[PDB]
Design a binder for this molecule. Sequence first.
Ligand code: XNG
Ligand code: CO
Ligand code: CO
Length: 250
Amino acid sequence: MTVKKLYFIPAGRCMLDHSSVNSALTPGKLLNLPVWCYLLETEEGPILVDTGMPESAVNNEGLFNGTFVEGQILPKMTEEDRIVNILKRVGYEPDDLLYIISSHLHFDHAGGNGAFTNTPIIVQRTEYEAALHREEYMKECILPHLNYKIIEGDYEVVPGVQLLYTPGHSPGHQSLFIETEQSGSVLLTIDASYTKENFEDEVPFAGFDPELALSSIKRLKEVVKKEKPIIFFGHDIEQEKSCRVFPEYI
Ligand SMILES: CCCCCCCCCC(=O)NCCCC(=O)O
Ligand SMILES: [Co+2]
Ligand SMILES: [Co+2]
């Protein structure tokens, strides 16, 4: 069984210093990068991958002033980019969703999690546990009483939707391997590679544990050699130019 539709849904944007996409570069040039969520229409119901940025980021580029990352991360988010507004425009309310999948709990992926208080939120145990104490996590991304479905390692969500454990960028980061009716095998790296060159050329990028991130890339390359998927990266300005986005699907 395959997924019926895989939608790429723009969920606002974020400025990052360009040393975050290539650790070699000298800081000083910001890049206006895409923030994504993905909607999977399946036999069993709709599944949302990631939930955009938090409320506090709306009309607030200076959100991280006063923090260790001041000036080097600036969210670009309007009221329209709140995940409940995105969902409503597409045609859903939060309680319609079968599952939320959190690739990881960075603020541009889990900022909207609080809107889903009934839907199971599938997240790696190592990511959940890290978010409870590491300083790069926002309180909006680790709310205590949501319906977490904590998993450990690779996991089949529904037929055609596989989670691949890809730690390194964050301690419990996970990627998606999807089989769609229209396109066959699709690999969503999410932040296991911001860009094509992080993946193909193993250019280092921002992460918790870059050595681990490299071994997760190598693991994904083994999957790619076996399955030959089309591959989409997490924060790639170049690839964004040719991506099919909502209302188009793959
Ligand atoms: C509470 C103050 C710190 C919160 C932000 C720390 C950012 C590092 C981790 C992070 O959120 N990176 C986002 C860039 C794209 C991504 O990697 O998701
Ligand atoms: Co991230
Ligand atoms: Co990200």
